[PDB]
Design a protein around this nucleic acid. Structure first.
Lengths: 94, 94
DNA sequence: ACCGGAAGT
DNA sequence: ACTTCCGGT
DNA sequence: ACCGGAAGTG
DNA sequence: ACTTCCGGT
């Protein structure tokens, strides 16, 4: 499982909406409890020392892959990119 | 490779523009020469008797998964859906 | 061309 | 995760 | 918080 | 494709 795959898994389950949920506008999501999310992702890839400062780095790595952008001004809020280039790197991550 | 991945791959190479290309209207794409795409897709799956009548069926299958929609009235034209529901189906196809 | 149910891999 | 068939629109 | 350039990763 | 570290604004 990749990071975005795991995030979608949490975003799709309504019982996680108290620490992570879709905003409603397009493909935009917010990390209500950023450390709660980082902890679960730490359990996933078995990285017990995983924090939000390290998880946000990978989200910033998605900027170069062009599959994510930072919603400026809104804290803990990111979004997926609606472009063919985004869907390309999505299907094939080199 | 899944069908939606195979299409994007062809859609990225500009030397395929005579039988498949994006339109510019967001995530909208057109299969200019359907049977040519079905031939190349039939090769991928080692099913040589593949045609557009069966490829388009899997495209209509993608409707229920929510990752695709038909641009009505526009012949050979489909599009990708930019919504959380679709993004969930790409991360978890079953 | 496009649709969508049903049976199959 | 599509493939195969197909009658209706 | 958010950024991102560098080195290490099984 | 991240993880770790951290000195940037």
């Amino acid at each position: 499982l990749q990071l975005w795959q795991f995030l979608v898994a949490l975003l799709d389950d309504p019982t996680n909406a108290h620490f992570i949920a879709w905003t409603g506008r397009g493909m935009e999501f917010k990390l209500i409890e950023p450390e709660e999310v980082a902890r679960l992702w730490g359990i996933q890839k078995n990285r017990p020392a995983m924090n939000y400062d390290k998880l946000s780095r990978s989200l910033r790595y998605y900027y170069e892959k062009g599959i994510m952008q930072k919603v400026a001004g809104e804290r803990y809020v990111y979004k997926f990119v609606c472009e063919p280039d985004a869907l390309f790197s999505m299907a094939f991550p080199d």
